[PDB]
Antibody
Framework: EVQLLESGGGLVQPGGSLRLSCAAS????????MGWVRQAPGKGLEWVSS????????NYADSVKGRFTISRDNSKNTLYLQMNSLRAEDTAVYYC????????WGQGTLVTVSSASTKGPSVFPLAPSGTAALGCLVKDYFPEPVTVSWNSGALTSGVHTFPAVLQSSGLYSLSSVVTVPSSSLGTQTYICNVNHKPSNTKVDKRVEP | QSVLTQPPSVSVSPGQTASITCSGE??????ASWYQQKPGQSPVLVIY???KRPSGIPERFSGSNSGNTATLTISGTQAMDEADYYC?????????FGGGTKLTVLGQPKAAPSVTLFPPSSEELQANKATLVCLISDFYPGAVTVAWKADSSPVKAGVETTKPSKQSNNKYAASSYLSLTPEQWKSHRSYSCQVTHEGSTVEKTVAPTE
């Protein structure tokens, strides 16, 4: 029913600009207050901005005031967040949320403000050997996030993807593993599907005994 | 700017009623709301305008507003209620959040880590690097110490370890990465990853393959 879907996340340089969207449905858009709320990694929620039904008026948190612009398009059921003069402080997941009291929320897009280059991960199989654990190493990338799945989505149970490390080099690395009966290692194939949108890195990798 | 302060952590025994407080300047002249955020999850509104529940939110969630204090109350608490809880207040002009309260539900069974140590892939080795991967999952409480050994000796550089993070089943996960050259890796007979959790140690060992 109520759908709030975001886009526009990614890497941006300090002082650069970026525009987020939130596409909405399942309810009468133009009747609702909308706004943005953000959350820097492992830290707390912070209101960014809100905007009236008609789009005729706006409010801002002090820290982004002057630098951000909230707007809406009531015909296309879309909310925007123009973000200029970006500062490293603006690095956060950005939440789309409907109404006076945030009663519905999107899934968030992550915005990373750094001077640093994107970097594609290298992806390597993690070989095993009752039960057996096989897996995938997603090494040395920037910024977050990566998506990892198995056998093109088909394989879902027994699957665990670990939170990444931030190495002192400032790159990330993470793994994801899957527990399987060891008997199936002879007569079943395993390929991990890894996507890293900011560098257009898409990788498949077979994991063999 | 105004602040909303919350206790950084709250612990409750199972079945009891959790109480989470929010205070700031002027909170009684304002409306309080509250949000439940689970790990890896978007926030969820549990109470708005001091003490109203959205349709869909159970009655064991309650909110009140007196003094300069809003208070969130959860009855019949169980472990699936573990989460971050944020108060929020408008009025006013701005929208203020509290720093969040972490809700620990006591009485969850101790659980030892499943550990899995991995050798470098052949591919990485042809690419002239090596990476050892130690995966630590399903442990409770969320504290681990992780040590690495080359043969029987401790490794004092090249180790990258995550802090522990709450899995959706309330247990915890962590990982540790040891970066090496192919030569370093091939020198020793073996490497070990040594994880100690609540006084007890699990260890795994891989070797070059040859």
């Amino acid at each position: 029913e109520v759908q709030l879907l975001e886009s526009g996340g990614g890497l941006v340089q300090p002082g650069g600009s970026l525009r987020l969207s939130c596409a909405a449905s399942g309810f009468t858009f133009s009747w609702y207050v909308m706004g943005w709320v953000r959350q820097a990694p492992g830290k707390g929620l912070e209101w960014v901005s809100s905007i009236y039904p008609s789009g005729g008026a706006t409010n801002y948190a002090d820290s982004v005031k002057g630098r951000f612009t909230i707007s809406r398009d009531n015909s296309k059921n879309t909310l925007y967040l123009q973000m200029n003069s970006l500062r490293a402080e603006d690095t956060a997941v950005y939440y789309c949320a409907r109404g006076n009291y945030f009663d519905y929320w999107g899934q968030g897009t992550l915005v990373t403000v750094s001077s640093a280059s994107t970097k594609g991960p290298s992806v390597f199989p993690l070989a095993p050997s009752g039960t057996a654990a096989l897996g995938c190493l997603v090494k040395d990338y920037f910024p977050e996030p990566v998506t990892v799945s198995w056998n093109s989505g088909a394989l879902t149970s027994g699957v665990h993807t670990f939170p990444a490390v931030l190495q002192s080099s400032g790159l990330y690395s993470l793994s994801s593993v899957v527990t399987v009966p060891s008997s199936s290692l002879g007569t079943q194939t395993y390929i991990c599907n890894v996507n890293h949108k900011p560098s257009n890195t898409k990788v498949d990798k077979r994991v063999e005994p | 700017q105004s602040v909303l302060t919350q206790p950084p952590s709250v612990s409750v025994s199972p079945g009891q009623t959790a109480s989470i407080t929010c205070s700031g300047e002027k909170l009684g002249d304002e409306y309080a709301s509250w949000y439940q955020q689970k790990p890896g999850q978007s926030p969820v509104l549990v109470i708005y305008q001091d003490n109203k529940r959205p349709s869909g939110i159970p009655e064991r969630f309650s909110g009140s507003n007196s003094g300069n204090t809003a208070t969130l109350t959860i009855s019949g608490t169980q472990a699936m209620d573990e989460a971050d809880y944020y108060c929020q207040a408008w009025d006013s002009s701005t929208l203020l959040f509290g720093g969040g309260t972490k809700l620990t539900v006591l009485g969850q069974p101790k659980a030892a880590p499943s550990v899995t140590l991995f050798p470098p892939s052949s591919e990485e080795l042809q690419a002239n690097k090596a990476t050892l991967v130690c995966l630590i999952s399903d442990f409770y409480p969320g504290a681990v110490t992780v040590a690495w050994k080359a043969d029987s000796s401790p490794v004092k550089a090249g180790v990258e370890t995550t802090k522990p993070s709450k899995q959706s089943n309330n247990k915890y996960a962590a990982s540790s990465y040891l970066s090496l050259t192919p030569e370093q890796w091939k020198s020793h007979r073996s490497y070990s990853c040594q994880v100690t959790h609540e006084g007890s140690t699990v260890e795994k060992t891989v070797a070059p393959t040859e």
